[PDB]
Design a protein around this ligand. Sequence first.
Ligand SMILES: Nc1ncnc2c1ncn2[C@@H]1O[C@H](COP(=O)(O)OP(=O)(O)OP(=O)(O)O)[C@@H](O)[C@H]1O
Ligand SMILES: Nc1ncnc2c1ncn2[C@@H]1O[C@H](COP(=O)(O)OP(=O)(O)OP(=O)(O)O)[C@@H](O)[C@H]1O
Ligand SMILES: Nc1ncnc2c1ncn2[C@@H]1O[C@H](COP(=O)(O)OP(=O)(O)OP(=O)(O)O)[C@@H](O)[C@H]1O
Ligand SMILES: Nc1ncnc2c1ncn2[C@@H]1O[C@H](COP(=O)(O)OP(=O)(O)OP(=O)(O)O)[C@@H](O)[C@H]1O
Ligand SMILES: Nc1ncnc2c1ncn2[C@@H]1O[C@H](COP(=O)(O)OP(=O)(O)OP(=O)(O)O)[C@@H](O)[C@H]1O
Ligand SMILES: Nc1ncnc2c1ncn2[C@@H]1O[C@H](COP(=O)(O)OP(=O)(O)OP(=O)(O)O)[C@@H](O)[C@H]1O
Ligand code: MOO
Ligand code: MOO
Ligand code: MOO
Ligand SMILES: [Mg+2]
Ligand SMILES: [Mg+2]
Ligand SMILES: [Mg+2]
Ligand SMILES: [Mo]
Ligand SMILES: [Mo]
Ligand SMILES: [Mo]
Ligand SMILES: [Mo]
Ligand SMILES: [Mo]
Ligand SMILES: [Mo]
Lengths: 244, 244, 244, 268, 268, 268
Amino acid sequence: RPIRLLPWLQVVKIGGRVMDRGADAILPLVEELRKLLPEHRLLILTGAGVRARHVFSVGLDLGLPVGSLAPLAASEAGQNGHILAAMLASEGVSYVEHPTVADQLAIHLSATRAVVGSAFPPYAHHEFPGSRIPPHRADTGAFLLADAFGAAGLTIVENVDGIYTADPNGPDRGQARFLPETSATDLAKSEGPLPVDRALLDVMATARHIERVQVVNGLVPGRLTAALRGEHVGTLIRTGVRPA
Amino acid sequence: RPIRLLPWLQVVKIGGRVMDRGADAILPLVEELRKLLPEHRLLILTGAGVRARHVFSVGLDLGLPVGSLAPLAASEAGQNGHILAAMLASEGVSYVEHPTVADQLAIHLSATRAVVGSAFPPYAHHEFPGSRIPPHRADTGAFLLADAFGAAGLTIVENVDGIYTADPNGPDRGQARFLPETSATDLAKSEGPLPVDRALLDVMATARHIERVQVVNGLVPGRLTAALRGEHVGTLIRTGVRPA
Amino acid sequence: RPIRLLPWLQVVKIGGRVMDRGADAILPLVEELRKLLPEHRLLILTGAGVRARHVFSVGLDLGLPVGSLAPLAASEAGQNGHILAAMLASEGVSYVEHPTVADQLAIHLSATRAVVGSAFPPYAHHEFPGSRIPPHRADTGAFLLADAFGAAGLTIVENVDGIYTADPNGPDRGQARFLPETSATDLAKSEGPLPVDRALLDVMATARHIERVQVVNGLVPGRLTAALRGEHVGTLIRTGVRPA
Amino acid sequence: NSTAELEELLMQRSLTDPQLQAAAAAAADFRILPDATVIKIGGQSVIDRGRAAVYPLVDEIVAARKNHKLLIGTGAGTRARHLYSIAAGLGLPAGVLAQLGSSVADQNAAMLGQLLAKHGIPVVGGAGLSAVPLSLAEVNAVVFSGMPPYKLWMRPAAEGVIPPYRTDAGCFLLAEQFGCKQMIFVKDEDGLYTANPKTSKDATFIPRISVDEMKAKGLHDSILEFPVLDLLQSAQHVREVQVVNGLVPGNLTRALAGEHVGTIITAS
Amino acid sequence: NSTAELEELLMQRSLTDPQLQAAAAAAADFRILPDATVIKIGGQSVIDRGRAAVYPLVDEIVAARKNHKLLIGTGAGTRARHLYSIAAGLGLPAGVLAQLGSSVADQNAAMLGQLLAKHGIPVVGGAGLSAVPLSLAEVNAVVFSGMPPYKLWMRPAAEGVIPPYRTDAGCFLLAEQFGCKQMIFVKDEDGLYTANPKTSKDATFIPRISVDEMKAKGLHDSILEFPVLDLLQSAQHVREVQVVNGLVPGNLTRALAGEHVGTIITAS
Amino acid sequence: NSTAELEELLMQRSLTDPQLQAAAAAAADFRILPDATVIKIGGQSVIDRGRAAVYPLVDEIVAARKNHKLLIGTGAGTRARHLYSIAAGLGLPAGVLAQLGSSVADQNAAMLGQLLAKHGIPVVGGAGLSAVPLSLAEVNAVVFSGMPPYKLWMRPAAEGVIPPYRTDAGCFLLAEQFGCKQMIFVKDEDGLYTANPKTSKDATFIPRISVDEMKAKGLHDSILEFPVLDLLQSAQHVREVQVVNGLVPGNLTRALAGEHVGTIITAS
Ligand SMILES: Nc1ncnc2c1ncn2[C@@H]1O[C@H](COP(=O)(O)OP(=O)(O)OP(=O)(O)O)[C@@H](O)[C@H]1O
Ligand SMILES: Nc1ncnc2c1ncn2[C@@H]1O[C@H](COP(=O)(O)OP(=O)(O)OP(=O)(O)O)[C@@H](O)[C@H]1O
Ligand SMILES: Nc1ncnc2c1ncn2[C@@H]1O[C@H](COP(=O)(O)OP(=O)(O)OP(=O)(O)O)[C@@H](O)[C@H]1O
Ligand SMILES: Nc1ncnc2c1ncn2[C@@H]1O[C@H](COP(=O)(O)OP(=O)(O)OP(=O)(O)O)[C@@H](O)[C@H]1O
Ligand SMILES: Nc1ncnc2c1ncn2[C@@H]1O[C@H](COP(=O)(O)OP(=O)(O)OP(=O)(O)O)[C@@H](O)[C@H]1O
Ligand SMILES: Nc1ncnc2c1ncn2[C@@H]1O[C@H](COP(=O)(O)OP(=O)(O)OP(=O)(O)O)[C@@H](O)[C@H]1O
Ligand code: MOO
Ligand code: MOO
Ligand code: MOO
Ligand SMILES: [Mg+2]
Ligand SMILES: [Mg+2]
Ligand SMILES: [Mg+2]
Ligand SMILES: [Mo]
Ligand SMILES: [Mo]
Ligand SMILES: [Mo]
Ligand SMILES: [Mo]
Ligand SMILES: [Mo]
Ligand SMILES: [Mo]
């Protein structure tokens, strides 16, 4: 298998809809991130959240193809990254652009304990056709990066406890059972909504390093910290990479 | 009020006309800056000086509007920043561009003790009309940044002791009385030349953090060092931000 | 003479044809570089190697001038830099672009122990005419930078022991005598192939700081380490800068 | 005055010196794109409304560029208001919000530009030009994002952290600094009224008004970003602006033809 | 369906929700450059061969752009294969190789673009446009590098580290996302055969075939990057592609004229 | 010679090998912009003088671009000399001064470009092209900054830290590498004299001279950067240059018309 470029890296993806809750969610998360800086080397990647739904609404009304919507959504994830990085600026943390993440992450994590970037991948007008909704979104981009780097882990910080059998905020909330552990292949064979991109399951099938990804509730202080220590406080997704 | 992004930052603006004196002024200043690196975290911003007057002369002769002159002047401040940074390169100091100052200053000051940038703000062709001379110049840009960051201070390093009641190098030099302390509002109500942008007084009126700015003579070794420790060795400008 | 911008810098140029040997050469070199990181502050610059010969073949067949071939070759040196930097990423090493090398090297070497860049200079479509082969190549660019910085040294890491009197892999290999030491002026007066750009000898004639450049065999582990300590394990080229 | 007297002042005085300021004011006045019209397409008032609002304006832009040179800047709209709300609740400063809002205006420029691409009209960017002169000469129009480039150097308002110079100001300043002949704001109301027509029953339409008259009427902050009115009074080149309803078919076309639809706001 | 039902789903559901996915599929379909043709000039099959292959295609491009709007993307070729071999032997991942391959396609775009510069045709870059709308309107053609922009976010193949989306995929996706009318791959064989014509004696030429038929015949990975066939089956706008031999004088010209030279591969 | 013999040398020898160098010299010679003329507008000699010098040249550029394709590069002038003096007194190296001087040439390109913007003529940048092919085809002219891109890799002079390759060299090298038909330096003297006409009473005008004759006459460093003369002797495409006085009305127009105003300097 490929070498691990940054084996000591921990990647943390912050859901766009967590950021959408504003200070009430972001301030505790920022304080938890502050306390984690001396413990881990962090690449923190932000998703897009509700503003990308609005630009999808406008863009779809204008007829625009999926390669046009993808960078419009990625912009919102970028804005969330600038917001979160500004909150950690006094700890030495800055937002870094995609080319910098791609080619200079090692020197930036040598300069400082964590950086923030956009979790969306730069598929832009080369997004795949099929759905009118860009398939390679924040979870998928974060996993692609984390696995490409051979990072020690990827933790997905959600506004719910993890993955359920139904949307726990949707019409079928009453049937929704929590899944403490699942495999990407089992999730991929289900139909129904998930809190993670469907494309995340596909890139997990071809992953080379990351064996598990935990989805944890960023609205509960301490769960991110516990997850980064391997404690089981959300849904573990087994990628189907086998351990040694 | 807004949070302080970089509360531990000290911002130092070096007058373009100080740089214009060449090695005789720059070498002592560089040695003083060298000694300050272990004491403070510094954003050093350079003004434009006489070359911007020349490009104003040409540009005004060609009829060009104030939005055309502003980036022509900002270029000269940028060149002064490259010169000063080159002199501190062996201490780890580099010039950083405006987008980097705006979005990645925290990681750069984590990597090294000081960086140099251009004090002019990037108003460029969106400079305000009214005067044919760009109003938002090096003092104004440096203060906007320092206050936006919530920095611990802004010190303006001049080729004179501070602010006088008249230009101490001008036709009325004989009437010029030194002002050890003044307020931005008092200065704004005066007509007559100042060593700081008039627009500096306007952005001081809307400032959120910086309570005082000292203008000190960079031609006197030790005054910058004393000013960064709060010692009163030049003109203090009270911004009208009130302390807690 | 000009000041030394980075007097503590060691510049190491890795031959493109060393990189062309792949893992068998690159892995030992990477391990030797790893061990050197705590001993020196390194700017590691990669040459172009065989791929630039292929793009010269195509470009010359298309009739393209030397200003078109120069950036095509520089691209291959850049790709070698990305490859080598990726191998040292877990040590904090990244590839940095030419403008960053030119203007921000000091802050990057403050963040981390070494960076990688392209050894070609950005002459691009302003390459000099005369030869149809771009004259200012990887050796020449690396020396220009090293001397401009006033670096402590430049070591050229080759796929041969040093300079011989004939190509030791060419038709006249049998007559090829090793030169443990030579001067740039003596080399310039010879006709015949060298393992270093002819333009390297010209910029050595106008050099201001670097007194000697050693060409050592990167295929022999330990020679780079010994060379960076001044031990004589390859060909020393005296530039004709005189010591104090 | 003279070039020599001005250059002497420019060398020997502070730029703050009133004598220098006055000599500089006598300099000749070159208009860079004197035949061009700057149009701002509102974000909340037009582009956020999707196809029913945008497609007819695309048709007008395409028809207009035959006889008119156009610089078409985009507003930001509801996604910028959302970003401002998140960032303001965190205590972030106006300079941080300024960059967030610009990203939204960029999104809108990209959407509008892709509807115009097959007509040859590009999206251009920068705190100035590069691509503008060639595009104006060849296809008579360009699309740009309307937000000013001030970033962290945005001047804050007297109160609160919302950037006071947004896309009305950005487009106006470009019209002013390029010396364009005309500035048209395309919104979702017929023009200025004596009160907000969306929240007041019997507001009266105002065809023409000066900035001073607007301030005396309490309309300082109404259909335009209020700082734009002060910029307008300081302007050298663009001394009036026209506000029109882009939801009315052909309104932009008729405004470009010299018809007095909407409200004309004059510097004096 | 309705805009309101779609916007309600877009606010209230995950984007993974099948109901949202289905409502989004009913959105109108805008083609950005519907009159343009995307052409891919092979790196190994054309540009690596130098003047004898490239100069006649330059002549065809120059003659074609009189009546056809062209986006001309370049392949990478043997220098990319060399970079892939060095990087694969070091254990580097597909995402690192993706950037290495792009540099080679950029070199080829620069070489081709310099032969076309005196005819006004520019090289343009980006994961999208900027310079494309204006250049297409004015000189009817642009040259671009064909590699997708995925960089370190390249999806790896099921096995090995060679990036699976290279310049066939890059050019195809641009044709698809711009809604172009036609996609022509310019290679060094007359079209698809029942076996590799370079390594098999009596391969039979196939004028027309569907992606499903190709897979059933074991031709999944033959004259096109195999992922391109799956992209083609998912495409909304470009539902067939044509593969032609650029080494045959006038073959590109005749393909642009509607002549069925080469192989037409259909999504269904 | 042959492609195969050249490619064999290119694979198997050092690029320093004389046999390879000689085989490469036999390659065909493609001119990228053979119909274009490069013009350098002096910084100290023209643009620093303001309106009286620049406005008539703007008029000539506008009239000339009807029948002539022009690449118009700018010099730097007195602000660059000031930067060189500050940086030289600090002991900074030629590579640092090179970047300082480029900023001044950029300022001059921006000023000139803004006077030409309404005629469609753009400012373009880079160590090469991008925007040049399209602009030349559509508006017949572009403006660029004349300084070479060498930055910290500038070769120093034998003595002192002033960069030896400045805007004369930058413009010349572009003319040479694009294979342009003509290179015109626009200065503030009628041409070359036997001595500096500003500091000598009875210098004699020289209509035509070779580089070798200039060196023998002690004019190596006179009206052109002396390294330009050596570049000229090495050039493949531009083997003579013309120096004209841009302060004389119509001098550039007449030079573009083939009139022998000024001094023609020949490589041999
Ligand atoms: N099977 C499921 N299990 C858990 N949550 C689900 C499921 N299906 C849908 N959801 C919904 O997904 C919501 C999270 O939405 P989403 O994943 O779009 O936000 P995000 O990950 O913050 O955004 P982004 O992808 O932009 O970073 C949850 O609050 C929940 O209502
Ligand atoms: N009231 C005043 N008090 C003090 N100095 C004044 C006053 N009015 C004018 N000056 C002049 O201002 C000069 C400083 O000029 P200026 O402020 O333009 O330079 P700078 O700040 O170095 O340049 P830049 O703004 O480009 O950084 C002083 O040397 C003095 O002659
Ligand atoms: N006089 C000589 N002494 C030693 N080697 C020579 C001599 N002349 C030619 N060579 C050849 O030069 C080869 C090195 O080639 P070259 O210098 O082109 O590679 P490189 O320096 O790795 O490439 P790049 O310049 O792209 O970094 C040696 O292996 C040798 O065959
Ligand atoms: N007196 C008034 N007359 C007319 N409109 C008014 C008045 N006062 C307030 N308005 C409001 O101003 C709005 C136009 O400003 P708004 O910021 O919505 O436009 P915009 O340019 O689309 O903004 P953006 O581009 O920033 O989204 C109108 O929709 C109207 O409701
Ligand atoms: N069944 C087949 N029919 C035709 N050609 C085939 C077949 N199978 C394999 N090929 C090979 O596919 C090649 C075309 O793909 P190739 O990757 O060489 O083209 P390319 O687009 O130039 O690549 P790049 O641009 O990545 O260099 C042909 O040269 C041919 O040898
Ligand atoms: N023998 C000579 N004949 C003519 N001019 C000469 C001679 N020797 C020196 N010169 C000087 O060379 C000058 C032209 O070079 P100069 O560097 O001023 O031009 P420039 O291209 O405007 O420079 P820049 O663009 O770098 O500002 C003339 O103004 C003239 O005084
Ligand atoms: O984005 Mo950075 O922080 O040195 O390359
Ligand atoms: O300009 Mo820098 O030093 O890593 O982003
Ligand atoms: O290229 Mo960078 O400037 O690592 O901070
Ligand atoms: Mg989610
Ligand atoms: Mg001052
Ligand atoms: Mg060598
Ligand atoms: Mo970047
Ligand atoms: Mo960059
Ligand atoms: Mo930057
Ligand atoms: Mo950047
Ligand atoms: Mo950069
Ligand atoms: Mo940059």
